[PDB]
Design a protein around this ligand. Sequence first.
Ligand SMILES: *Cc1cc2c(cc1C)nc1c(=O)[nH]c(=O)nc-1n2C[C@H](O)[C@H](O)[C@H](O)COP(=O)(O)OP(=O)(O)OC[C@H]1O[C@@H](n2cnc3c(N)ncnc32)[C@H](O)[C@@H]1O
Ligand SMILES: NC(=O)c1ccccc1NC(=O)Nc1cc(Cl)cc(Cl)c1
Length: 456
Amino acid sequence: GGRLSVDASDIAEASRDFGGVARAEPMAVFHPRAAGDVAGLVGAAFRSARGFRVSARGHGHSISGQAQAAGGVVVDMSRVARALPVHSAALGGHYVDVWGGELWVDVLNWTLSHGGLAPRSWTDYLYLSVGGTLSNAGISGQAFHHGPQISNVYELDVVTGKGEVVTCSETENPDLFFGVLGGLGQFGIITRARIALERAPKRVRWIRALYSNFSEFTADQERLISLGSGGGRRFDYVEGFVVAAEGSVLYCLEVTKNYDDETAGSVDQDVDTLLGELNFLPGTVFTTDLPYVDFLDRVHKAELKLRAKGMWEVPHPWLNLFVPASRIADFDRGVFRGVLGGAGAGGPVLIYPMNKHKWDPRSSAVTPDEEVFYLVAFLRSALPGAPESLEALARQNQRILDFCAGTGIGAKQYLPGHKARHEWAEHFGAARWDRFARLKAEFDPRAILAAGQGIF
Ligand SMILES: *Cc1cc2c(cc1C)nc1c(=O)[nH]c(=O)nc-1n2C[C@H](O)[C@H](O)[C@H](O)COP(=O)(O)OP(=O)(O)OC[C@H]1O[C@@H](n2cnc3c(N)ncnc32)[C@H](O)[C@@H]1O
Ligand SMILES: NC(=O)c1ccccc1NC(=O)Nc1cc(Cl)cc(Cl)c1
């Protein structure tokens, strides 16, 4: 049912990603119509003499060629009939079956228009594929409470590296299910994901507050993510970002309170009660009220403004770290004040804590060995048409990694950009590496899938 393409625009797109550095060209791009077509192509790679590389491409948002299949085939998973949300009395809630290539923005619009339902856990950017985020984790300000998107999926259909279509969940083929979740595309291509849904809020009370004291900023973020664990008043989203003085450093706390027709009468009091317990700088509270879809789509709005200034399609040497909360204080003087002290085209530096117990330890996701850890995301872009800007940002990234290494911070890379075998063994640790290698031997022995990750 599917078709191979050698269109130069298709080859060019499959040869690049949002990072703008890795450029390994495939021989062709495969456009599937259904799961059987993907099984057909992977099965042919497995049976073939050479065993050509096959990688699925979501929206191409990888930073360092993770979706590239050098001299092989890139499966363009982008999109046909769609399954309606379903209620289950056994699960005690709703779910929706989605194609692996579906973008979260399209999932949201579908579930809202069919019962006013929505996924509970997001990414900051919705123009990402379901299969792509589920192969990593999928985090945003809801992860402290609902866990990442890999903690909000009931079942998958996976095309293994042998071209076999397998339905898997916690009860059926769990090794493949938990292996695939956070599995960096190593054990198969997700063709269907069964996403957990909740009754969507209608609106969002979106708040930002400034801090000059890092100890107060982190203590407040850590206090906020411990709320609702006892079932009470809490925010529905907890993020943060590092701000430069002009326009020495400030920390911005970013929170939301979700509401609908029922809770609209208690939203102002819930917000004031939660904010009264915090230590932000007086007079630095910025508030906005907008529809839920608009809050969730906030980064796409920033993107359209950047595309207008020719500032979107530039190199993105983005670095994402998970930092144990016990070492976050040291992280600030050495990195935010140290390494970054004194930038390129600019970009956010995100910072917020998450609860490890919301992450299933059976999945392939690698988190620090601590109950509370932070995402620290260095999302700086290089200047357009200025290669030296990319070089300076890459040296800053290596300085951050050397700082963590030299002070023994047990940080773990999110969307790991490792390429050496000893870096991967170190990343996973002995037990996880052993589980990872064994899963690879079982589901992708010829190392056909997602070879751009550079693990096998
Ligand atoms: C560009 C970007 C990325 C991003 C983000 C904002 C922007 C502007 N915000 C994020 C956020 O708030 N939280 C988060 O967790 N991630 C965020 N990201 C990063 C994003 O998750 C990753 O880039 C991820 O790779 C998903 O992006 P995409 O859908 O474009 O996928 P890809 O880059 O093409 O592929 C990634 C890897 O997975 C394999 N792959 C792709 N599709 C599948 C399927 N269906 N099944 C199995 N494996 C799959 C690729 O081969 C590659 O290895
Ligand atoms: N305010 C933002 O979150 C933002 C603004 C402009 C461009 C990107 C944005 N956010 C973003 O890219 N978040 C993201 C990006 C990655 Cl690669 C990984 C993770 Cl955990 C988070």
